[PDB]
Paper text:
We then obtained an X-ray structure of 5-[name]-[name] (1) in complex with [name] kinase domain and the stable ATP analogue [name]. The structure shows that 5-[name]-[name] binds to the catalytic site of [name] in a similar orientation to 5-PP-[name]. While crystallography previously showed that 5-PA-[name] binds to two sites in [name] (the catalytic site and a surface-mounted ligand capture site), electron density for 1 was seen only in the catalytic site. The electron density for 1 clearly shows that the planar amide unit adopts the Z conformation, and with the amide NH antiperiplanar to H-5 of myo-inositol. The carbonyl oxygen of the amide is orientated similarly to one non-bridging oxygen atom of the α-phosphate of bound 5-PP-[name]. Additionally, one of the fluorine atoms in the CF2 group stretches its position to that of the other non-bridging O-atom of an α-phosphate, which is expected to bring the negative charge distribution in this region closer to that of 5-PP-[name] than occurs with the PA analogue. The terminal phosphonate group in bound 1 is held in an extended conformation although its orientation is different to that of the corresponding β-phosphate group in 5-PP-[name] bound to [name]. Note also that the 5-diphosphate in 5-PP-[name] participates in complexing a hydrated Mg2+ ion, a property that is mimicked in the complex of 5-PCP-[name] with [name].7 This Mg2+ ion is not present in the complex with 1. Compound 1 inhibited 1,5-[PP]2-InsP4 metabolism by [name] with an IC50 of 375 nM. In addition, the rigidity of the amide unit in 1 means that the [name] unit contains fewer rotatable bonds than the equivalent PP, PA or PCP structures.
Diphosphoinositol phosphates (PP-InsPs) are an evolutionarily ancient group of signalling molecules that are essential to cellular and organismal homeostasis. The PP-InsPs are formed through the enzymatic phosphorylation of myo-inositol hexakisphosphate (InsP6) by inositol hexakisphosphate kinases (IP6Ks) and diphosphoinositol pentakisphosphate kinases (PPIP5Ks). Among the PP-InsPs, 5-diphospho-myo-inositol pentakisphosphate (5-PP-[name], also known as “5-[name]”) is both the most abundant and the most intensively studied member of this signalling family. Metabolically-stable PP-InsP analogues can also be informative for structural analysis of enzyme/substrate crystal complexes.
Author numbering: 43 to 359
Write the structure that this text describes.
Amino acid sequence: QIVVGICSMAKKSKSKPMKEILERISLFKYITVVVFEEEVILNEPVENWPLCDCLISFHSKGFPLDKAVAYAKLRNPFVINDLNMQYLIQDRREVYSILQAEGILLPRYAILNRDPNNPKECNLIEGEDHVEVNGEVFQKPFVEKPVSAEDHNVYIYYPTSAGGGSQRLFRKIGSRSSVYSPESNVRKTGSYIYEEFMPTDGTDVKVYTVGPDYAHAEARKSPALDGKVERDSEGKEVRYPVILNAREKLIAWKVCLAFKQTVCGFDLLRANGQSYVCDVNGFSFVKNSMKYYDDCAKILGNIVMRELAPQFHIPWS
Ligand SMILES: O=C(N[C@@H]1[C@@H](OP(=O)(O)O)[C@H](OP(=O)(O)O)[C@H](OP(=O)(O)O)[C@H](OP(=O)(O)O)[C@H]1OP(=O)(O)O)C(F)(F)P(=O)(O)O
Ligand SMILES: Nc1ncnc2c1ncn2[C@@H]1O[C@H](COP(=O)(O)OP(=O)(O)NP(=O)(O)O)[C@@H](O)[C@H]1O
Ligand SMILES: [Mg+2]
Ligand SMILES: [Mg+2]
Ligand SMILES: [Mg+2]
Ligand SMILES: [Mg+2]
């Protein structure tokens, strides 16, 4: 049997989408799935981790990426989602630099780095209705993102013409994704990316790749609006249908290969007749789509078979 190893925190490994997809991958005649126990990932040295021929491994809060990297170096499996790139995906400055190198449209932005060892002072000038970051002017409205991609405390600053103040986004807490603050002054501690506000129809497009030639998209209400989460009868966030255009399918192809993440979530802003990438999240499954479960398991199983069938001497056409 070809062994597919799943290496992630239990919250991910035991998620509904993961269980649905692993059950379908196991339907492949020559594939066996081994899900690495969280206790083993955290507390056992990598030399005691299970063997696999193909490794599906991804960082989330609490995951020891250093260990996953050492395991891949030790055992040299076929890696679906590159582990070294998952360090860069944690840093919005590294994400944006990769997108730029790939000729991918993204909001105009500037980085404000505050050295806490070298705070003689910042390169930031603030007016009522704009900031200047290393000389570059952002008129309100503009967006302020922590450089840490794991920190979801993204602020939007409104112009005087629209009543001033700010919208403070955060990781969903039940009914809410953002709240208005009367505060008009930017944050004075930390490092941030400042970017131009892209005007959408009030929705974000979420894109989910399975290799560079498959991308499911769906839309949700922007947290940049009032911050009230729309939930269905079953208490799941309301999703709106999306079909990607030819330009957007090319963006998905580029993001998947540039970040070396077979399974990759990213966000698109449909604005000014174009589509801008504002976030790359790495490993992410579509939630509550049976057809996605079917398609994702079939593509990942076929990738494994195409890559490893020859050295296993298994017929594959
Ligand atoms: O907010 C939710 N789930 C989110 C995950 O949070 P966890 O439940 O895993 O903590 C989050 O994971 P982290 O970034 O917090 O680790 C990530 O799920 P992912 O691991 O599949 O990426 C994210 O999706 P993205 O933001 O798209 O990465 C999910 O949000 P939903 O897409 O709303 O389910 C929710 F509470 F489950 P819902 O019931 O509101 O969907
Ligand atoms: N330049 C922008 N213009 C307009 N809206 C933006 C912009 N950047 C971000 N947003 C909005 O703010 C939301 C959060 O920004 P995003 O960079 O996706 O944050 P995050 O903290 O990485 N979220 P997540 O998708 O869960 O990882 C987006 O979904 C948009 O609705
Ligand atoms: Mg099987
Ligand atoms: Mg994540
Ligand atoms: Mg996002
Ligand atoms: Mg993100």
